[PDB]
Amino acid sequence: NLDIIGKRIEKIKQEHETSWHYDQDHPYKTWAYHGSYETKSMVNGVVRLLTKPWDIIPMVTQMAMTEKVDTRTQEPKEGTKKLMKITAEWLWKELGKKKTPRMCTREEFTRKVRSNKWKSAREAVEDSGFWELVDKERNLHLEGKCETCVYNMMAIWYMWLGARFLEFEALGFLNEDHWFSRENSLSGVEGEGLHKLGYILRDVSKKEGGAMYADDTAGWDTRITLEDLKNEEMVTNHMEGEHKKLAEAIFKLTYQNKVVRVQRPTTVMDIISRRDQRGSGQVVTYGLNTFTNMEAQLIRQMEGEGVFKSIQHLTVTEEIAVKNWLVRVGRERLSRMAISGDDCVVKPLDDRFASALTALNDMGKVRKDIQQWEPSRGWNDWTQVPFCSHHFHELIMKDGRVLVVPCRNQDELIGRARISQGAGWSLRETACLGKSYAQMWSLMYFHRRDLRLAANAICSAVPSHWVPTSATHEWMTTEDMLTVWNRVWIQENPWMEDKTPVESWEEIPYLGKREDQWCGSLIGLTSRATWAKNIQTAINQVRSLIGNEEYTDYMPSMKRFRR
Ligand SMILES: N#CCc1nccn1CC(F)(F)F
Ligand SMILES: [Cl-]
Ligand SMILES: [Zn+2]
Ligand SMILES: [Zn+2]
């Protein structure tokens, strides 16, 4: 502990030697406090002016206004611990069968920062001194020591660009080489895209079994145990030479021991430490969350099938039974799930899964909004299952071909598009962000009447050649959106046997009007009728603010506006 954290703490203490104050009123129970020192969402106007009816919907307007991290998870039982290690060992082998671990490069890192001591990260990557500091820490990590890998809590834990690269170097391959691809993981959806998730849930529904279960975990990142962090580290058993040592060092020194700087208003910076819970880059968090969630859900499926009786201790024959289950049905059982970090849908063999709660509760993966020992409520219809903040409609085109389309409450979609992240945005930057939302809506949400109309209005109000700005983001392009639609929904869609291109937006269907209203459409209101009727006047208001640019009228892509 202090041997691994001291240097990091020793170092911060000196840079603030004229402030070190061991505040005795520190609020930390579960975090080890080490000392203190002295320290100190905007509305997108283009989207809002073209969505006026929503100016009076509180669910939209409130979205733009405005003691769980300090908890302690218990050590699981011996039987639980054995089930986790055996499952983790087998899972890493399976993920590894068709992938080779490998180091990610300065080059790869240098490129990303350029596609989004030093002001920005863009500058540091172009300074040799930064890489020299990286070299110093890198050689420190080969030595089994750490000086500069310190979390900054804000719950999103920032590190300085150097520590990020060393994380990326060692573990980037998990994301960069698609370890949690459905093809490689069977349960995963990494890189799948929102136009694929519905087809994937429908494929799970086709399996023989019971209800579909979609239990959310109450603060997944705070329930990651030291035993979880150790089972994740076993990916290093698949590595070699330098890589193996670098990966080991990130797991030992930054994940399984942590130093964090936090702002407290009583304003001081508190330097706290702990060994458990999740703390990594958002992208390594995603991959290790998916891995550990895959492991927890295979084990819950084991308990429902009665592969083991007691979590208190596992017999020698029970280890044989668990190992044999994995070898004979593990792959089939993985296929019965869709897992995206802390998010899952499971279609188990039968409904015994609903009351199989002992291992799940003992791993610390306690379900949200349900009593600890109350059986899970399953879904009977795949089109009602929540996954990745969506539900999925089955939608038949005039020509009989089947679209499985993503959906959510339309107030959420309009409230998000009306928000920009940051300040110093030009009108052109603001317009280009509005266009990114409009093109997403045309590609993913075309079946919502209000969104197809608002999307066409925004793309009409923003100069035709201005480039949109901000899994798979096909709407980030200047190509014609009907051509992108055809590629995404027809040409590249493995669930579509007939590849006949669509020739206009009118061949592309909407939900039923009642279904559209159920999911938050304002179709049928007076406010929405006036907006639709007078849309060219809203389009002209925004054109006049942006100025004398080249614009396209997209509204005649819709029949009601086609004269
Ligand atoms: N595994 C990792 C980190 C990662 N993957 C994609 C982007 N990033 C962030 C980084 F650029 F490295 F800082
Ligand atoms: Cl249902
Ligand atoms: Zn370090
Ligand atoms: Zn819907």
d(CA 25, CA 259): 20
Contact 270, 264 (CB under 8 A): yes
* CA torsion through residues 200, 203, 208, 210, sign: positive
- Ligand 1 atom with the smallest distance to the CA of 161 is 13
Name the amino acid, one letter, at 509. P
Say if residue 252 carries a ligand binding annotation: no
| Ligand 1 pocket residue status of 175, Cβ below 6 Å | yes
**Residue whose token pair is 């819950």:** 300
Residue 276 CB-density burial (10 A; 0-12 exposed, 13-18 middle, 19+ buried): buried
Vertex 182: Cα angle to 245 and 471 (nearest 5): 85
Q: Which CATH class is domain 1-38+105-171+225-276?
A: alpha beta
d(CA 407, CA 272): 42
Name the amino acid, one letter, at 202. R
Residue 178 CB-density burial (10 A; 0-12 exposed, 13-18 middle, 19+ buried): middle
Largest CA distance in the chain: 78
| Ligand 1 pocket residue status of 179, Cβ below 6 Å | no
Please count the other Cβ atoms lying within 10 Å of the Cβ belonging to residue 135: 12
Contact 346, 301 (CB under 8 A): yes
Q: 252: closest CA among 397, 149, 114?
A: 149
Method: X-ray
d(CA 358, CA 371): 13
Return the best residue to mutate from 103, 164, 235, 286 for the ligand 1 pocket (most ligand atoms within 8 A of CB).
164
CA dist 342 to 77, 89, 278, 296, 338, Å? Answer: 22, 20, 12, 11, 11
* Resolution for the entry shown, Å: 2.0
Regarding beta strands 343-346 and 337-340, do their DSSP bridges make them parallel or antiparallel, or are they unpaired? antiparallel
| Ligand of minimum distance to the alpha carbon of 168 | 1
**Helix, coil or strand: residue 198:** helix
Please count the other Cβ atoms lying within 10 Å of the Cβ belonging to residue 243: 18
Say if residue 391 carries a ligand binding annotation: yes
| Ligand 1 pocket residue status of 163, Cβ below 6 Å | no
Please count the other Cβ atoms lying within 10 Å of the Cβ belonging to residue 479: 11
Q: Give the residue ranges of DSSP H helices in 97-240.
A: 106-114, 121-124, 128-142, 161-171, 173-176, 182-185, 194-205, 226-233
| Ligand of minimum distance to the alpha carbon of 408 | 4
Terminal alpha carbon distance of the chain? 73
Q: 60: closest CA among 524, 436, 418, 361?
A: 418
Instruction: Look up residue 555 and give its two tokens.
Output: 């509204």
Instruction: Look up residue 514 and give its two tokens.
Output: 């009642």
Burial code of 286-310, b = ≥16 C-beta within 10 A, e = fewer? bbbbbbbbbbbbbbbbbbbbebbee
Contact 208, 336 (CB under 8 A): no
Please count the other Cβ atoms lying within 10 Å of the Cβ belonging to residue 319: 14
d(CA 189, CA 390): 14
Instruction: Give the CA count within 13 Å in the CB-facing half-sphere of 386.
Output: 9
d(CA 276, CA 269): 21
Contact 101, 177 (CB under 8 A): no
d(CA 390, CA 161): 33
Say if residue 518 carries a ligand binding annotation: no
d(CA 226, CA 224): 7
| Ligand 1 pocket residue status of 468, Cβ below 6 Å | no
Closest-CA residue, ligand 1 atom 1, reads: 172
What are the two backbone dihedrals, phi and then psi, of residue 341, each rounded to the nearest 5 degrees?
55, -125
SS3 content of the chain, % helix, strand, coil (to 5): 50, 10, 40
d(CA 117, CA 375): 55
Contact 151, 260 (CB under 8 A): yes
Could you list the beta-strand ranges (E) of 212-267: 258-264
Instruction: Look up residue 367 and give its two tokens.
Output: 């379900």
Say if residue 203 carries a ligand binding annotation: no
Contacts of 25 (CB under 8 A, 6+ apart): 266
| Ligand of minimum distance to the alpha carbon of 161 | 1
- Ligand 1 atom with the smallest distance to the CA of 174 is 1
Which residues are 340's β-sheet partners?
Answer: 343
Q: 297: closest CA among 372, 215, 377, 227?
A: 215
Contact 334, 298 (CB under 8 A): yes
Instruction: Give the CA count within 13 Å in the CB-facing half-sphere of 44.
Output: 28
Burial code of 46-67, b = ≥16 C-beta within 10 A, e = fewer? bbbbbbebbeebeebbebbeee
The DSSP code for 387 is: B
The DSSP code for 491 is: I
Contact 31, 387 (CB under 8 A): no
**Residue whose token pair is 């290790």:** 288
Contacts of 427 (CB under 8 A, 6+ apart): 46, 545, 546
| Ligand 1 pocket residue status of 177, Cβ below 6 Å | no
* CA torsion through residues 412, 417, 418, 421, sign: positive
Closest-CA residue, ligand 1 atom 10, reads: 164
Helix (H) or strand (E) holding 345: strand 343-346
Contact 294, 338 (CB under 8 A): no
Contact 161, 168 (CB under 8 A): no
d(CA 356, CA 193): 31
d(CA 439, CA 79): 51
Parse the chain into domains and list their residue ranges.
1-38+105-171+225-276, 85-97+180-223+285-362, 391-561
Helix (H) or strand (E) holding 396: strand 391-396
CA dist 380 to 194, 214, 352, Å? Answer: 22, 12, 15
d(CA 260, CA 265): 16
